[PDB]
């Protein structure tokens, strides 16, 4: 079957859902209308120790977003989290 990672995004739980909301505003504080863009993601990239170009993150936003905005919204941010969070089974 398909849509396995998004199924958890739609359901999930308030404990993890509200957590993505609290971890989303800090990621995008001044990006367009509250959407994590290449510049916002690059800010956290420097904390790890790497400073890639805006194109590196532009590919990341295209893989999880394709609605025309080209920016990680609250849903796309939480959807990208479960992708690398794996499942419980």
């Amino acid at each position: 079957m398909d849509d396995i990672y998004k199924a958890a995004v739609e359901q999930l739980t308030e404990e993890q859902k509200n957590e993505f909301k609290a971890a989303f505003d800090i990621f995008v504080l001044g990006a367009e209308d509250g959407c994590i863009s290449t510049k916002e993601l690059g800010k956290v990239m420097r904390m790890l120790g790497q400073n890639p170009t805006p194109e590196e993150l532009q590919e990341m936003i295209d893989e999880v977003d394709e609605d025309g905005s080209g920016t990680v919204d609250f849903d796309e941010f939480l959807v990208m989290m479960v992708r690398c969070m794996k499942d419980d089974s």
Binding site: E19, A23, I26, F27, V44, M47, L48, Q50, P52, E56, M81, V82, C84, M85
Partner: peptide, 20 residues
């Protein structure tokens, strides 16, 4: 290439690495 981020890893650096 050293480009990879995890949910817990990014969260720990978001509200932990010089943040909280």
């Amino acid at each position: 290439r050293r480009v990879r981020i995890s949910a817990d890893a990014m969260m720990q650096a978001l509200l932990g690495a010089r943040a909280k």
